[PDB]
Scaffold this active site. Sequence first.
Site, PDB file in Angstrom:
ATOM      1  N   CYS A 131       0.822  -1.208   0.000  1.00 58.56           N
ATOM      2  CA  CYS A 131       0.000   0.000   0.000  1.00 58.56           C
ATOM      3  C   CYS A 131       0.862   1.268   0.000  1.00 58.56           C
ATOM      4  O   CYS A 131       1.912   1.350   0.673  1.00 58.56           O
ATOM      5  CB  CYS A 131      -0.931   0.042   1.215  1.00 58.56           C
ATOM      6  N   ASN A 176      -1.186  -0.939   6.334  1.00 59.01           N
ATOM      7  CA  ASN A 176      -0.575  -1.954   7.180  1.00 59.01           C
ATOM      8  C   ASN A 176       0.710  -1.464   7.832  1.00 59.01           C
ATOM      9  O   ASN A 176       1.528  -0.779   7.207  1.00 59.01           O
ATOM     10  CB  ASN A 176      -0.262  -3.199   6.357  1.00 59.01           C
TER      11      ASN A 176
END
Lengths: 320, 321, 321, 320
Positions: free
Chosen positions: D1, D80
Amino acid sequence: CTGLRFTDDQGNLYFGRNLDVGQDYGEGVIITPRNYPLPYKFLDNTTTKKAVIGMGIVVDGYPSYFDCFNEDGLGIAGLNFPHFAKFSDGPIDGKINLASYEIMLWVTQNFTKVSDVKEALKNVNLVNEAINSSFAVAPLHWIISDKDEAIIVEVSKQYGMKVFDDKLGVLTNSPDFNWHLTNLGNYTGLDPHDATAQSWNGQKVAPWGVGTGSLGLPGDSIPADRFVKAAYLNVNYPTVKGEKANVAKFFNILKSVAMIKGSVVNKLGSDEYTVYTACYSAATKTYYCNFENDFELKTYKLDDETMNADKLITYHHHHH
Amino acid sequence: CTGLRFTDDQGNLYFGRNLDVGQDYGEGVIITPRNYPLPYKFLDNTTTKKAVIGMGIVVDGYPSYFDCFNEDGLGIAGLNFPHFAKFSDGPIDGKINLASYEIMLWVTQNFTKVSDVKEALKNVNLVNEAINSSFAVAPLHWIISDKDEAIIVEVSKQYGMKVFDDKLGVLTNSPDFNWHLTNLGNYTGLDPHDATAQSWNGQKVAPWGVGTGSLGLPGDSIPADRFVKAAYLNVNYPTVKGEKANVAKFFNILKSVAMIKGSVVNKLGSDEYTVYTACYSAATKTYYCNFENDFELKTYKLDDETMNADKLITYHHHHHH
Amino acid sequence: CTGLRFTDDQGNLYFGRNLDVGQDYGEGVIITPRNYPLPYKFLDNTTTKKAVIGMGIVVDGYPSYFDCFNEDGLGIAGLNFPHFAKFSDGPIDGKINLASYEIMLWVTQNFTKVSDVKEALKNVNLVNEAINSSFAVAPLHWIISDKDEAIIVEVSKQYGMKVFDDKLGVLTNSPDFNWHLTNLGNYTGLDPHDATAQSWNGQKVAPWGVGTGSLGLPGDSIPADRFVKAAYLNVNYPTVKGEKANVAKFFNILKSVAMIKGSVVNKLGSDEYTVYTACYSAATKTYYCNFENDFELKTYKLDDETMNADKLITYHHHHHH
Amino acid sequence: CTGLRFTDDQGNLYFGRNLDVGQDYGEGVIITPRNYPLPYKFLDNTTTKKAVIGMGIVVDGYPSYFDCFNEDGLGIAGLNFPHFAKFSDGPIDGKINLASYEIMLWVTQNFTKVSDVKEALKNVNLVNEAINSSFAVAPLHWIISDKDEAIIVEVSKQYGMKVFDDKLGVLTNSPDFNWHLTNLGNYTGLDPHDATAQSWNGQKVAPWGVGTGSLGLPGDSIPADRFVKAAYLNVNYPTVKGEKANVAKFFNILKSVAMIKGSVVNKLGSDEYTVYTACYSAATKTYYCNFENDFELKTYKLDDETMNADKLITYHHHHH
Ligand code: NA
Ligand code: NA
Ligand code: NA
Ligand code: NA
């Protein structure tokens, strides 16, 4: 393997190599004196006219050199060229035919100037022929240097026989020399000068230490990466004065691009590393080397005693 | 600078450093004998009880070491820690107060085990005080080692005093040690094992020489990159047998990450490079070193003569820069 | 520039390119219909027999393509090849003589199989002749593809005319194609598989996130580095099913190696960046494209109307730089 | 991400993220209207006062957002933060206690300015508590942005709760944000300007194409490398004018650092890749996205109809 040359301010040559291998070849220092018998596979047999020194093995009285240097300041080192090196399947009429292993002594026995070697190589054919039945032909290319210039000699199945001027003073392994020269253009972003503080949209981004100009310089042992690094180091290292400083400079550069034991394991399970680093000083006729397990510099000399001996002078093999 | 330590198969320590600088400091090898006068800025003055050897300068009779090693096989090296290192404005009541330059002798004189050094450091305070008004306080961090463990000592404005166990056996410069440790996780893709031939949609793509599994290993002199390479080499170098082989392994590793003359020019215009490489062998009490312009190994020894000398034993200074 | 081709599971071709330039050329999408007048500098003038679509400019009624694709599913793209590309001083008796700009239409008009293109090229001579005195001869090399094979055509001062099979399906800029192919062997250490936790002399060194096996993959816009990354992505991207998924895969790959505005400034002071990305889908005869300042996919089609048009069909020029 | 934000010349915000995962989470676009029931684990239950849009799942009527953006131009994305993220094992007296998943709506429902969020976070405690029995707590950190500033919120076992100003406008994954900021100083050698021809001891070494100034820029998907690349791209990308150009600019940057399918296989055997890229334009209240298998931009809008609906508006899950 990495080969290296440069000069001091007065044209004294320093020229040598790392030997990076995955097994022991039993080599040692060998002095070949003048008037030693010198057979040829495809030419008249003769005797040596110049004394030479270097590292190698003795095969039925023939000194088979990994690198060697004549009393007149001209040397040659053989380095691996796998997947490219390919010699003639037989001698050719009208050529000077040499089995590929004979090139070491042919160069050091007949020349003192690289410019002369260059002209003679135009009628030379290298032949795919072993010293005898129990040896394979090694897939080598060579770096040859005197105090004025270095050339690269490559005979490949891709391109035939090619001879390059080597202004970088370095040679490694495959691929071919022009590929490596071309690869340098991708590293023009390298700069010895440190970077300075920057504003990334107002965020201060600044070096933590020196060295930031060489971002991207590879440190692994892939031949193309050692080539780029050795070339960069050699051309930016200042000229230095005197024997001690120039020998130290030589070992500084080659120990920087050395293959460190334990960091390379080949596909057969063996460590590959720099087993020795060696430097010939033409000015003192001295062959300096050290070893992976013995770091103090050893010296071996061409002098009036050894240049005129009656047999080969061979030093016991240094056990790795 | 790069500090390095490891042992052989018998627990004999090999511990030393590269000095990468951009100016001359006048340094040379100094043996400090037993029973030599030892003043302290903030403690009772005393005398040395162990002999020590290492590189440094002498300032008004006080041996100021860049690195030094005591006869009992414990040593310490100071390395630059800029933009981080910060010490106290003055002494603190109740703490063992040391001007930061005094840490070299305080450690080598009072300890033989890094475990004991660790415990004492809980009550130590480092003071921003120079040796005299001619010298500035150097922004140092330190690596300390015996045969069993190595620790890093960092005192920073950002984090205060931190002590780290150093299983990698290496230290360079800024940023802080936990930063470098964290960086190693980004290099788990490194592998000493060579790659082999592959089929890229039927195109044969095969290595040209050995070394392909260390793709991405940085070769420059940025402290983060020297840390990764030095740690990678040290942990993968096999344990070797005997004095000659171990000393050579040490120089092999540190010369691999040496800062090469001409390849680094700082923002003031000076060349930064490894002016010397030094290795202390605890088993022979021998300090080995060589220099950028003199590659032969020079050796200096703590023995029954030098350890009971009546003065500092100082060898000449090798000029550089 | 980066050229790219692959097929789906049914042998449907997806073939296109990024255009990375530092100035505006006035280009736009051009459909050339069947039976359109086709002059040649050194051959008998004729008319087009297949319709073609692609990006380019119109010079005095002649559609000069940057890339173009014929209704039978064979296409060609021209990419910069500086410091290498060199063509003949003039025509050569007995050869098929083409000014280098004429190769785009000569290929798309006369062939449907790259195998036939390969055979004809043995008697082709490319001539250093511009379209008129207002334009300079562009130093191009070319990638040509149908559903079965792709070839690279390079005509250089160093090597003369060379034709390479391109199993990687990619092409960028200089140096020559065999140089790039050779470079791939140096990247055999790349691995899509993540590393896992390791013990560095008992220090746990473990990845922080996925991706660790591609350590060393270059992220910059140097042509060698875009070639390695583009080849690595193309050969490891799975074969996907259907038009939408395959077009998206194409743009996914080329946008990964796009040259991003602001990140490259050439020695003349201009930004070099990907002004458009284009994909030809042979199965739908559709040319897809988007632009640096307009990300929506625009589509243009060879169908029964456009292929039998009475004129060139030209869509407006999207300004850049 | 990778999360990304920047503004045009008039302070219109463009803010979004790539979702780089190794499995399918069943997410889809969700519009939460005003006056929707908003329960809290450790605070009084209430209702939403602002409409929000973003990608997520619905758990017993609770919209659990991966990223979401309120009608007033303030958004938040969760990314994350493995091996670091660690929340309180229970609520603390005197704090504003939020289960970590509640932060998405708490931020978007109560604030319009990041400066206010910053002051409120001084009394916030994030609690290690799942939405319900069949969910684990996700180890997230967050990027929050309005048109004036972006902050990073990280709560870790190493460092507790830390809030950083993010002038780079980017966020990736582990390690912690200060580690990444510190890492940029090692990349000060990067320069957008091309290098030029050089003389390496008289050998011409010259660029073959443009791009040589960014030698060393990593192109792999390691979080630290995407961070460096995204940061470099974002701060050197010029400001551009209008909705189309700014949305295109957003996708140019995030598709550059996207994780390409097939190039990353995790230790469990699954491909990890960018399944969607999304951008919220505060000026048009429009959520743009595309997908690994469907490249045309999709749009979803907060408007007078959707901001005032009586239920959640949920779009079927896009099948990967
Ligand atoms: Na003979
Ligand atoms: Na005192
Ligand atoms: Na004609
Ligand atoms: Na409640």
